[PDB]
Amino acid sequence: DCGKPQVEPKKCPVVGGCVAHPHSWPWQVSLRTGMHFCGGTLISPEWVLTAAHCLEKSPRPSSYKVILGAHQEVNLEPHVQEIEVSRLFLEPTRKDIALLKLSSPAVITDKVIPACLPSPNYVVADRTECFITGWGETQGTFGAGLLKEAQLPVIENKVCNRYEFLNGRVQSTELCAGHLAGGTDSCQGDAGGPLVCFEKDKYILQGVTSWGLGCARPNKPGVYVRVSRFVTWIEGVMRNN
Numbered sequence: 001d002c003g004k005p006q007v008e009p010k011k012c013p014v015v016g017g018c019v020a021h022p023h024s025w026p027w028q029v030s031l032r033t034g035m036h037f038c039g040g041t042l043i044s045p046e047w048v049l050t051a052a053h054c055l056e057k058s059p060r061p062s063s064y065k066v067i068l069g070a071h072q073e074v075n076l077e078p079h080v081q082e083i084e085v086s087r088l089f090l091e092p093t094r095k096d097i098a099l100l101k102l103s104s105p106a107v108i109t110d111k112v113i114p115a116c117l118p119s120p121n122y123v124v125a126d127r128t129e130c131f132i133t134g135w136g137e138t139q140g141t142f143g144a145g146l147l148k149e150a151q152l153p154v155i156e157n158k159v160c161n162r163y164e165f166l167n168g169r170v171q172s173t174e175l176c177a178g179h180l181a182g183g184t185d186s187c188q189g190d191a192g193g194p195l196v197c198f199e200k201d202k203y204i205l206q207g208v209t210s211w212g213l214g215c216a217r218p219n220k221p222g223v224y225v226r227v228s229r230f231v232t233w234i235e236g237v238m239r240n241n
């Protein structure tokens with residue numbers, strides 16, 4: 001199954017946001033060199049989707065290991081799965097997304113479950129509230145060392161591209177999300193991680209955390225790779241590899 005967590009997530013009462021209910025984001029992975037540096041999303045037992053820039057340092061699959069089922073970043077709880085990577089696939093048109101093929105398939109449990117993929121070309125609607133998760137910088141917000149989440153509204157690209165916001169920087173193959181007043185956002189260390197949206201009864205991976213003009217700054221929503229524009233490619237890679 002995909003996108004349905006066995007442990008249900010909770011909304012809040014990553015900069016700002018809140019600590020996630022443990023194991024409520026079971027597709028969240030930690031990409032490591034043993035130091036956490038990026039996030040990723042399990043999309044199938046043997047496939048993880050992340051950001052290409054997370055792999056800029058090394059083109060060798062051996063440089064990387066994936067931690068699945070975690071909540072704590074450092075003291076990795078017992079049942080965590082640590083799997084090596086056998087192959088790296090950078091998106092072929094230099095977009096900031098990549099696939100990692102795991103050496104062995106992750107075992108699906110109550111704490112390790114893949115997120116679902118969207119249909120091709122779907123466009124998350126303006127104002128849709130989605131969630132981002134990760135173990136990255138908190139910029140003086142609490143939660144360091146534990147998996148955090150933030151619920152953010154999508155900002156349609158036409159708006160996001162205005163001078164007041166990102167000023168033409170955003171591609172159709174990207175989406176924007178964030179609270180314009182600032183204070184809550186994904187940040188460095190969350191890159192490559194998921195932006196998921198609840199659709200009917202489960203969570204669909206709609207974005208991959210990519211970049212931003214800072215973190216949690218006013219009028220500067222985060223930019224995510226729009227997964228729906230890469231589903232066909234992803235499917236092809238999975239099928240042929």
Ligand SMILES: NCc1ccc(CNC(=O)[C@@H]2Cc3ccc(cc3)NC(=O)CCN3CCN(CCC(=O)Nc4ccc(cc4)C[C@@H](NS(=O)(=O)c4ccccc4)C(=O)N2)CC3)cc1
Pocket residue numbers: 053094096169170185186187188189190191209210211212213214215216221222223
């Ligand atoms: N939710 C906020 C959030 C969440 C997670 C993260 C973590 N991710 C990064 O850290 C991110 C790494 C990176 C990603 C994509 C890249 C290059 C580099 N892609 C191309 O290389 C591909 C080639 N081009 C690049 C340029 N494109 C045009 C549009 C454009 O200009 N895009 C920008 C602008 C600025 C940057 C990157 C990209 C550099 C910093 N921004 S920052 O302000 O300095 C900063 C300071 C402190 C904290 C955060 C950010 C930035 O985000 N790097 C066209 C294609 C960051 C932020």
